[PDB]
Amino acid sequence: NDFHRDTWAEVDLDAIYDNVENLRRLLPDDTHIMASVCGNAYGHGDVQVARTALEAGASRLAVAFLDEALALREKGIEAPILVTGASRPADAALAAQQRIALTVFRSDWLEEASALYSGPFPIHFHLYMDTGMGSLGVKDEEETKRIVALIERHPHFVLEGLWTWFATDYFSYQYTRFLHMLEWLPSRPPLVHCANSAASLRFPDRTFNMVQFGIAMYGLAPSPPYPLKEAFSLHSRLVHVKKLQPGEKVSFGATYTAQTEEWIGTIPIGYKDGWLRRLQHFHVLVDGQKAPIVGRILGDMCMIRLPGPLPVGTKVTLIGRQGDKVISIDDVARHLETINYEVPCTISYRVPRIFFRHKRIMEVRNAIGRG
Amino acid sequence: NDFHRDTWAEVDLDAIYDNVENLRRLLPDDTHIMASVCGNAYGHGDVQVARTALEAGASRLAVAFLDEALALREKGIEAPILVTGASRPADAALAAQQRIALTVFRSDWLEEASALYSGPFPIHFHLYMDTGMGSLGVKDEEETKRIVALIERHPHFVLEGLWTWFATYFSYQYTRFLHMLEWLPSRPPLVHCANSAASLRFPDRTFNMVQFGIAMYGLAPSLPYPLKEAFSLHSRLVHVKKLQPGEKVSFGATYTAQTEEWIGTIPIGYKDGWLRRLQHFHVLVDGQKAPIVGRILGDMCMIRLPGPLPVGTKVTLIGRQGDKVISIDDVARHLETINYEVPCTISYRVPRIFFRHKRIMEVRNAIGRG
Amino acid sequence: MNDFHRDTWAEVDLDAIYDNVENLRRLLPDDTHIMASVCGNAYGHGDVQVARTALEAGASRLAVAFLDEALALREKGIEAPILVTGASRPADAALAAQQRIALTVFRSDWLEEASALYSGPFPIHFHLYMDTGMGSLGVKDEEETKRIVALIERHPHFVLEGLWTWFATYFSYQYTRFLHMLEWLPSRPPLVHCANSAASLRFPDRTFNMVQFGIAMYGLAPSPGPYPLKEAFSLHSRLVHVKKLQPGEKVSFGATYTAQTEEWIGTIPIGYKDGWLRRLQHFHVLVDGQKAPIVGRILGDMCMIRLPGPLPVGTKVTLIGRQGDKVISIDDVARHLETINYEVPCTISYRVPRIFFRHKRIMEVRNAIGRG
Amino acid sequence: MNDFHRDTWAEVDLDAIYDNVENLRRLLPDDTHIMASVCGNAYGHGDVQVARTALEAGASRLAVAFLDEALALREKGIEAPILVTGASRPADAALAAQQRIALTVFRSDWLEEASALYSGPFPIHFHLYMDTGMGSLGVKDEEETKRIVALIERHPHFVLEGLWTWFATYFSYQYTRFLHMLEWLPSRPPLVHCANSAASLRFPDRTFNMVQFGIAMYGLAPSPGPYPLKEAFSLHSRLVHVKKLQPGEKVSFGATYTAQTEEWIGTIPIGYKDGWLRRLQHFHVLVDGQKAPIVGRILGDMCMIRLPGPLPVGTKVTLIGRQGDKVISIDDVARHLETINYEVPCTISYRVPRIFFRHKRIMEVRNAIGRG
Amino acid sequence: NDFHRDTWAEVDLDAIYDNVENLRRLLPDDTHIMASVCGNAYGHGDVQVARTALEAGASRLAVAFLDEALALREKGIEAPILVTGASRPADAALAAQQRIALTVFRSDWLEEASALYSGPFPIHFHLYMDTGMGSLGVKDEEETKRIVALIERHPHFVLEGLWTWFATDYFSYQYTRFLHMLEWLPSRPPLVHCANSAASLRFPDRTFNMVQFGIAMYGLAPSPPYPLKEAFSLHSRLVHVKKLQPGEKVSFGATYTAQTEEWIGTIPIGYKDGWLRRLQHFHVLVDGQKAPIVGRILGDMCMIRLPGPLPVGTKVTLIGRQGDKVISIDDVARHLETINYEVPCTISYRVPRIFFRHKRIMEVRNAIGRG
């Protein structure tokens, strides 16, 4: 709800709405769109992103483990949800009562589940096929047969889907093998899909009747027809400004020595906020200009060298646009020497999220706010 | 409450209790101990750590910004709390109502607070003195005098204390503090400092309250009593694949087996705070050091097992497993950062299990139902 | 849980509220909004009940005296726009912004303070109150108006939504004086209104695209004097005891009372703690269709009335309202009290239940001190 | 959530309540209970706050005017015994019984009706109110007393807990008349008390093992005149606007006001909707330590005062209480209003926050219309 | 809380307090007392009875299945609780987090449990030994060994107890066999107990360090030093009375013909209240006299022939005392041709319970009351 530190993230839900609407137009009315909202929508806000996606065209959601699926249900999400990661056989009943589909990786798992669950709710499963270069998943025809047999036998089990993850030139091997495995099934599952496939993201396949719109939904390219809009931005404000004389010292994480007369500003964001120490020499946007982060990043604050004296309260943009200049997630990731996925995800619970929709503030989410 | 993924953190509150208890001895019965629980107790659990510290002898708590203090109050903590970072003057009433003390860095700030606030609750302020190498704080007698004047005049303003942060030399800042301290008409009820290697070791002051920083968590921020580490991180294998010589595995990149081996996948990734730079780090499984192979994904990472191991086998990322042990400093070293950052990065989606007296006290799942 | 356990209550006929506003909505052009005033818990009629009835009848905006009253409405489900017409603290702008509540500004100094202490993220809507020279507050000159306009245009989250004034009840002078102040603004604000203007309720005035239906919305003539206004508030109680007295007999109900002749005295459970002030000591109430004088001093929780012959316990007494062909209006009570009508319903305390009627059928009962 | 957003509030010094009762508890013998009266939301001081303070100071029982007030106390955690001193419905006996609330009985007919409609399972405690001849209600003869006694002894769940009367303020006559009515009972009831007896507050009277600390508990003399009583209620506001006027200048605040000379007028956010009635139009308030007259008519949410020279916005105005060496008591307000002290605090509306002080430190703030 | 039909049950908690206090005095300070509160305390009120028992001397509670144990925890009971009946292996985690001990009947069950549960809470088990004439339980040394092995291996499993049910002249066989089985355990479990043993209910055994105070705690003899006090009573009131002339007819469930001038009274209790139809010719107490139930018992009412005309509101006692006359549970059971256990248990949720303590009403429990 309300927050009391001048540091926050903004989530432009129109960027998310637009991205999904454009994909919904491109793909044939036959293909479903599954929106990925794991890790609290990659740090964007699980329920806010989920509703916007469903509203724009998505029809199903994907999360990493059971708790993320239960969080969506509790917050009012009624659309289908698939747990793409591992789960405990003992939780079958729970997932079943909550109408949450689960992915199966081993026949061994389904047997445990079929043995400790008798009903009354029907539980839907999706099989993850290991095409041969994976670390997990169904690996052979024998195993595939055991799984199919356990489902048709059990009165509450339902084989809803089949999918796999395509690594990114192994596409050949990983596809011919998949097509081969898909034939081991007596009949074609209601939903055939896959993840991390730029191919089925632009060109139609048809072997797949559901596409997984992963990180691209957030305007981030998963690997460096319509443009993608970035939805995440990060801001803060100067809470102090100190003028330094030449030669003067200031001990941030280490020791900084002013080479000339300059002004140092402190903003209330640090590595506890997910603004990692490696961003030690990155720059930020203040008063429309670029300003360098000097000295080490502290736990709850970091210092920036200002062009001249600015008043406390001046807005600082860490990720986003100011004037004609811009800083994107890729820029931050590049400086950190990591992938864009990791950036928004690392922005901790401590930082409130402000959601915009139709160029207008919709709501504020302060994970540690009162209530 | 409950959790449904085999990944979790453990917080030994006995480690917290003992660390505070030890410091409670070395310090004279006249000096308060202030426990810092900012950042949700550095990833350990704000209310849990807070209560434990208060039981072991601590009397006040410190957080970085107002929302953290308000959260501690909403959770039932009644002990005095000090906001060490910046706050908005327009929030003075809110702070006063909740009995939250605030740190003052400029006279302009108080000037605004004074005009915006009229009562009826009293607001306790702590003056932060800039000895010289800081990025903020009060530094001249002129401003210090303005602050003392604003408070005296205001019916609901109270100068509760003054402090400074000793960066790490110490000899200069010290005498400089004593000098600045003498500017005040009357010595404040509380005079404390933060990050003082000598305030821990040695008592004696000047200082009737010392800030037990990260040390309370058993992390050396760089003597006459041992410090216990209170944080451990664990997970379990959720799948095991056997590989033949030369067999390939397309993880985050291309990995090739060079012998018969088994690879275990654990349900923890970078979206959990287990950052990608840990791709060549070792974890603990079956009492042995197993290396993380390939790249660390968002929700999972792979490890070469010391041999065939069943699903469910317990994997320890930070902590002890039999004869082997992985400390926080170890992880920090690999990542090339400081220990502080490690636990603080373990995300909200990772449950914390609290132990007290060698036995499980509670579970907290930040995303559990309710 | 809205039950009550004392035979004393007030009745709020929401059909009267609905009809009064519906009539006004008919008269005014579609371009003209109707602002419904619901300060003071809708002048003792029930804030949320009156608000939604006024809204359903054609009103599109609400007005309250201070921030708390606005927050109370939002907490009770009201979503329509709300304007705080009285003073507020600069430091509460954020709270008001977060809650979509507009604030009235009377001094540039106030805005200067609010501008310096607020930075976002919600936009805050302001209405400037102009002092046309004979008031006790408000913007009075062009230089201050410009400073204000400047501050708003300069602040990214500040919005100039309206402008208004209160015409004292010398009107011709104020009206023209207001037109001058209007031109002091670069452009015309989204909403231009005024209050206490009987004229704006009789004839549509192109100058204002929003009119304030003050106390008249409750059927009370804001002054001495197009459509019929119906009152919505009545007050009732019941006899809880009756006693026959002989000539000369004394009774000490606050003061000494001597029965000049054989008579019957009834006691009803309502007193000054209920807002039925002591000054109503010799007013007449309705019982069994007859006017009966309240004799003796009014106590905190009860008062005695001289009855027109024997009557059983449980007999309905009407303090304000109709009984048979006899009627007692709020103005009748005000007159006896030597005060204005506005004050009567507002004084009927929080401990007197309000029974709401809609479509000639009970709708809800709200007992401010009931369990829950 | 007990924050408020208008600079107008009342203060309740619970130390005063504690001290007044503590003094009474010292005087009265251990066999004598003290009943604390908390009807009317503790005469506008806050029911639960005053109740528990009185209880902590030595009072062992509470009194309210009607059932709802008693249910409100129970819902707020009060466990001490409560007596409804006013009328109630026979059909509510079960509810009252279930909640351990005692009821006053004034007529045998009432008990007959309650006996016929209640059968259990909770016991219900009654206190008989005797009319000593000069009252307007209560049991008046021995035959009715016997019928009542009979009904109770006959009903398994009915209990005769007490007997009391109200001595008018002819006392010698009533006292003796009460002793006669007392002997009409087979045995002496567990509790025998009376109300409005200054005597019972000065000297211990073996006839009553429980005394009613009425309004005196609030530091208000129930009449004109052993221990010092301290007042617990003050009322405050702040200037929200100030305007300098020249000689002859006019201001229309309800009525026309002409400045006979250069002067400064301040406006505070409190009006008749807050219980600060219009009749207080020429009363004096405290501002900057000086007495200042309220000039012009009091509006619903504000009133203007003539200031002693220029003063900034935010200056504290004290309507009731002390400022410097000047003081304004409740009796001073009552006098100007031509009413009794009892009525003043009771009239200060539900929308004015009450700030409670205990041990010279703020304890809680209860804003009846605050969020929550 | 409140109820609005003149039919109710009274539970004298002093009867329960006294019974337990007397047993606590008799047994040595070494032996624990386990109070049985299954079936909502045999229709007496689970939480009310549990607290009273713990307060009088009991230290542990027993319920039939998991939900009854969870109901006690939710209502504030923190004392130990044992599920004496069957439970699902998948619920181990739940019982574990709630500190609820479970009974194990097969090694097969423990294996399923040990396989789907890894932690973090310790779960306590009690082994039910089948002495040879049971329908379930551990039957041999091999099975006993497997169970012991699974517990010591698993880091969270704890063997807390061992018990069995003694049928009631097979006591010999069922005891010598039990003593024999008890030796198969490496060490003696912390708690050794048994159920339905009148023997260990009066005379000390010592082989058992915990006695199960079953139905006797309620003042009911489980098979027809200090006396037992009956805690349950049932009442109602006449809601109508009709005078009949000789020869007159009234069609209750069937057809009743008045043989003479008589008065018929109707009370608002029927078989939906658990006042079964077979009580068709039982008698009840009204105005201190016995009165016969005439005509069939209806769903929500039943008729009684009154001595003379009584007013509506007159109290009717179905189980309890009026004047010098009394009706006990055994009387009702005898008429029904069943055991006393079944009577209070059958008194449905529809009938509120009024609890007394120290000859004073403590609280009312109306299962279908508002809230």
PDB file of N, CA and C in Angstrom, chain D residues 18-59:
ATOM      1  N   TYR D  18      -8.675   8.683  37.902  1.00  0.00           N
ATOM      2  CA  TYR D  18      -8.045   7.771  38.833  1.00  0.00           C
ATOM      3  C   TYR D  18      -7.976   8.405  40.217  1.00  0.00           C
ATOM      4  N   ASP D  19      -7.464   9.629  40.278  1.00  0.00           N
ATOM      5  CA  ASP D  19      -7.330  10.322  41.548  1.00  0.00           C
ATOM      6  C   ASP D  19      -8.668  10.582  42.238  1.00  0.00           C
ATOM      7  N   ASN D  20      -9.677  11.020  41.488  1.00  0.00           N
ATOM      8  CA  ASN D  20     -10.976  11.276  42.102  1.00  0.00           C
ATOM      9  C   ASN D  20     -11.535  10.025  42.757  1.00  0.00           C
ATOM     10  N   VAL D  21     -11.488   8.903  42.052  1.00  0.00           N
ATOM     11  CA  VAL D  21     -12.014   7.663  42.607  1.00  0.00           C
ATOM     12  C   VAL D  21     -11.126   7.129  43.730  1.00  0.00           C
ATOM     13  N   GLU D  22      -9.812   7.199  43.548  1.00  0.00           N
ATOM     14  CA  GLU D  22      -8.874   6.730  44.560  1.00  0.00           C
ATOM     15  C   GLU D  22      -9.169   7.427  45.882  1.00  0.00           C
ATOM     16  N   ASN D  23      -9.444   8.726  45.822  1.00  0.00           N
ATOM     17  CA  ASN D  23      -9.762   9.484  47.024  1.00  0.00           C
ATOM     18  C   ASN D  23     -11.043   8.981  47.680  1.00  0.00           C
ATOM     19  N   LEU D  24     -12.034   8.641  46.861  1.00  0.00           N
ATOM     20  CA  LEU D  24     -13.299   8.144  47.382  1.00  0.00           C
ATOM     21  C   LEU D  24     -13.125   6.757  47.978  1.00  0.00           C
ATOM     22  N   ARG D  25     -12.273   5.949  47.357  1.00  0.00           N
ATOM     23  CA  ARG D  25     -12.027   4.588  47.816  1.00  0.00           C
ATOM     24  C   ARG D  25     -11.309   4.587  49.162  1.00  0.00           C
ATOM     25  N   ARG D  26     -10.569   5.655  49.421  1.00  0.00           N
ATOM     26  CA  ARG D  26      -9.833   5.800  50.667  1.00  0.00           C
ATOM     27  C   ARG D  26     -10.844   6.042  51.790  1.00  0.00           C
ATOM     28  N   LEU D  27     -11.710   7.024  51.563  1.00  0.00           N
ATOM     29  CA  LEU D  27     -12.746   7.417  52.508  1.00  0.00           C
ATOM     30  C   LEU D  27     -13.741   6.317  52.895  1.00  0.00           C
ATOM     31  N   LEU D  28     -14.384   5.704  51.907  1.00  0.00           N
ATOM     32  CA  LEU D  28     -15.378   4.661  52.166  1.00  0.00           C
ATOM     33  C   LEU D  28     -14.796   3.372  52.744  1.00  0.00           C
ATOM     34  N   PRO D  29     -15.527   2.736  53.677  1.00  0.00           N
ATOM     35  CA  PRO D  29     -15.079   1.488  54.303  1.00  0.00           C
ATOM     36  C   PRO D  29     -15.014   0.364  53.284  1.00  0.00           C
ATOM     37  N   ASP D  30     -14.119  -0.586  53.515  1.00  0.00           N
ATOM     38  CA  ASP D  30     -13.930  -1.706  52.602  1.00  0.00           C
ATOM     39  C   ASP D  30     -15.199  -2.483  52.279  1.00  0.00           C
ATOM     40  N   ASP D  31     -16.214  -2.362  53.129  1.00  0.00           N
ATOM     41  CA  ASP D  31     -17.473  -3.062  52.901  1.00  0.00           C
ATOM     42  C   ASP D  31     -18.322  -2.345  51.859  1.00  0.00           C
ATOM     43  N   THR D  32     -17.986  -1.086  51.601  1.00  0.00           N
ATOM     44  CA  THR D  32     -18.724  -0.271  50.653  1.00  0.00           C
ATOM     45  C   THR D  32     -18.120  -0.222  49.247  1.00  0.00           C
ATOM     46  N   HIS D  33     -18.888  -0.685  48.260  1.00  0.00           N
ATOM     47  CA  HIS D  33     -18.441  -0.677  46.868  1.00  0.00           C
ATOM     48  C   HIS D  33     -18.637   0.697  46.259  1.00  0.00           C
ATOM     49  N   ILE D  34     -17.921   0.937  45.167  1.00  0.00           N
ATOM     50  CA  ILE D  34     -18.049   2.179  44.431  1.00  0.00           C
ATOM     51  C   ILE D  34     -18.539   1.802  43.044  1.00  0.00           C
ATOM     52  N   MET D  35     -19.666   2.376  42.648  1.00  0.00           N
ATOM     53  CA  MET D  35     -20.236   2.126  41.325  1.00  0.00           C
ATOM     54  C   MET D  35     -19.849   3.318  40.456  1.00  0.00           C
ATOM     55  N   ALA D  36     -19.199   3.052  39.325  1.00  0.00           N
ATOM     56  CA  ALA D  36     -18.789   4.133  38.419  1.00  0.00           C
ATOM     57  C   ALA D  36     -19.795   4.250  37.272  1.00  0.00           C
ATOM     58  N   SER D  37     -20.306   5.457  37.080  1.00  0.00           N
ATOM     59  CA  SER D  37     -21.285   5.759  36.048  1.00  0.00           C
ATOM     60  C   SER D  37     -20.586   6.103  34.742  1.00  0.00           C
ATOM     61  N   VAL D  38     -20.832   5.305  33.704  1.00  0.00           N
ATOM     62  CA  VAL D  38     -20.201   5.547  32.414  1.00  0.00           C
ATOM     63  C   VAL D  38     -21.179   5.591  31.241  1.00  0.00           C
ATOM     64  N   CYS D  39     -22.397   6.056  31.505  1.00  0.00           N
ATOM     65  CA  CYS D  39     -23.408   6.200  30.448  1.00  0.00           C
ATOM     66  C   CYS D  39     -22.996   7.352  29.534  1.00  0.00           C
ATOM     67  N   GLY D  40     -23.550   7.395  28.327  1.00  0.00           N
ATOM     68  CA  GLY D  40     -23.199   8.467  27.408  1.00  0.00           C
ATOM     69  C   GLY D  40     -21.726   8.468  27.015  1.00  0.00           C
ATOM     70  N   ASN D  41     -21.178   7.279  26.778  1.00  0.00           N
ATOM     71  CA  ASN D  41     -19.768   7.137  26.416  1.00  0.00           C
ATOM     72  C   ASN D  41     -18.960   7.890  27.479  1.00  0.00           C
ATOM     73  N   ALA D  42     -19.249   7.583  28.743  1.00  0.00           N
ATOM     74  CA  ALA D  42     -18.609   8.220  29.904  1.00  0.00           C
ATOM     75  C   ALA D  42     -18.706   9.738  29.796  1.00  0.00           C
ATOM     76  N   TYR D  43     -19.928  10.214  29.584  1.00  0.00           N
ATOM     77  CA  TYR D  43     -20.191  11.634  29.451  1.00  0.00           C
ATOM     78  C   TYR D  43     -19.220  12.268  28.477  1.00  0.00           C
ATOM     79  N   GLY D  44     -19.099  11.649  27.307  1.00  0.00           N
ATOM     80  CA  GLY D  44     -18.204  12.152  26.282  1.00  0.00           C
ATOM     81  C   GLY D  44     -16.715  12.032  26.565  1.00  0.00           C
ATOM     82  N   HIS D  45     -16.326  11.253  27.574  1.00  0.00           N
ATOM     83  CA  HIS D  45     -14.905  11.088  27.895  1.00  0.00           C
ATOM     84  C   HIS D  45     -14.313   9.786  27.352  1.00  0.00           C
ATOM     85  N   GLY D  46     -15.161   8.857  26.911  1.00  0.00           N
ATOM     86  CA  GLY D  46     -14.681   7.576  26.408  1.00  0.00           C
ATOM     87  C   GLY D  46     -15.059   6.488  27.400  1.00  0.00           C
ATOM     88  N   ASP D  47     -16.057   5.679  27.048  1.00  0.00           N
ATOM     89  CA  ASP D  47     -16.543   4.654  27.957  1.00  0.00           C
ATOM     90  C   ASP D  47     -15.535   3.630  28.467  1.00  0.00           C
ATOM     91  N   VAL D  48     -14.894   2.900  27.560  1.00  0.00           N
ATOM     92  CA  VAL D  48     -13.950   1.887  27.992  1.00  0.00           C
ATOM     93  C   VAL D  48     -12.715   2.444  28.696  1.00  0.00           C
ATOM     94  N   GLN D  49     -12.208   3.591  28.251  1.00  0.00           N
ATOM     95  CA  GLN D  49     -11.031   4.180  28.882  1.00  0.00           C
ATOM     96  C   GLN D  49     -11.335   4.603  30.329  1.00  0.00           C
ATOM     97  N   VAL D  50     -12.449   5.300  30.522  1.00  0.00           N
ATOM     98  CA  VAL D  50     -12.827   5.743  31.856  1.00  0.00           C
ATOM     99  C   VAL D  50     -13.180   4.551  32.741  1.00  0.00           C
ATOM    100  N   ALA D  51     -13.870   3.574  32.169  1.00  0.00           N
ATOM    101  CA  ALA D  51     -14.271   2.391  32.913  1.00  0.00           C
ATOM    102  C   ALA D  51     -13.087   1.662  33.536  1.00  0.00           C
ATOM    103  N   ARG D  52     -12.110   1.269  32.723  1.00  0.00           N
ATOM    104  CA  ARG D  52     -10.965   0.553  33.266  1.00  0.00           C
ATOM    105  C   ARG D  52     -10.089   1.385  34.197  1.00  0.00           C
ATOM    106  N   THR D  53     -10.113   2.708  34.063  1.00  0.00           N
ATOM    107  CA  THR D  53      -9.315   3.562  34.943  1.00  0.00           C
ATOM    108  C   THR D  53     -10.010   3.582  36.310  1.00  0.00           C
ATOM    109  N   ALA D  54     -11.333   3.717  36.284  1.00  0.00           N
ATOM    110  CA  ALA D  54     -12.124   3.738  37.502  1.00  0.00           C
ATOM    111  C   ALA D  54     -11.995   2.388  38.197  1.00  0.00           C
ATOM    112  N   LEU D  55     -12.005   1.317  37.415  1.00  0.00           N
ATOM    113  CA  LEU D  55     -11.877  -0.018  37.967  1.00  0.00           C
ATOM    114  C   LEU D  55     -10.512  -0.232  38.622  1.00  0.00           C
ATOM    115  N   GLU D  56      -9.459   0.265  37.978  1.00  0.00           N
ATOM    116  CA  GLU D  56      -8.105   0.120  38.508  1.00  0.00           C
ATOM    117  C   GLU D  56      -7.916   0.943  39.768  1.00  0.00           C
ATOM    118  N   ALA D  57      -8.703   1.998  39.908  1.00  0.00           N
ATOM    119  CA  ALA D  57      -8.574   2.878  41.065  1.00  0.00           C
ATOM    120  C   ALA D  57      -9.380   2.461  42.292  1.00  0.00           C
ATOM    121  N   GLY D  58     -10.194   1.417  42.173  1.00  0.00           N
ATOM    122  CA  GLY D  58     -10.965   1.008  43.329  1.00  0.00           C
ATOM    123  C   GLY D  58     -12.448   0.788  43.103  1.00  0.00           C
ATOM    124  N   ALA D  59     -12.988   1.276  41.990  1.00  0.00           N
ATOM    125  CA  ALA D  59     -14.401   1.054  41.705  1.00  0.00           C
ATOM    126  C   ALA D  59     -14.535  -0.432  41.355  1.00  0.00           C
TER     127      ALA D  59
END
